[PDB]
Amino acid sequence: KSKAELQSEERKRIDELIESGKEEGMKIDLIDGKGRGVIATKQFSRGDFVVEFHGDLIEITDAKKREALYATGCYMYYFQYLSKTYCVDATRETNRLGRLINHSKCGNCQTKLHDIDGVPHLILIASRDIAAGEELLYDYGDRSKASIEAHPWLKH
């Protein structure tokens, strides 16, 4: 297969996983010092789709409004797309697992923007093989002095 053919196939796998919302190979656990986390129940291989960070897709004005009212945990994921700020707001309690995944700067998932015909989705891709029983972790990416003073776990 060519690079394009491999990319096409991966896109098709991802699109179909976004659509099904299929969230296999993961479960909730209580992890010391973190509250809930999500742990692998099967091995994931480097590059596998893991899960969508799924919630309410919103623009910046609404995201500010909502965060003024929340300030309730932190389940808001900001990103840039076509020169504008969006947010995936996962505050509302659902059975979706991406929202329960905890933070590490040296985790095992990497968030990627995935476009489907003009609608942006935030997806987690395994950045290395992930062992059964290990906690899923990605970088939340807030390095601000204000946040880290209050939440030193952001530093690690």
């Binding site: 929340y70 932190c74 994921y77 900001y78 990103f79 939340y140 807030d142 946040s147 209050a150 952001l154």
Partner: peptide, 8 residues
């Protein structure tokens, strides 16, 4: 009191 997540 709060932090966010930011795609990087």
């Amino acid at each position: 009191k709060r932090h966010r997540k930011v795609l990087r």
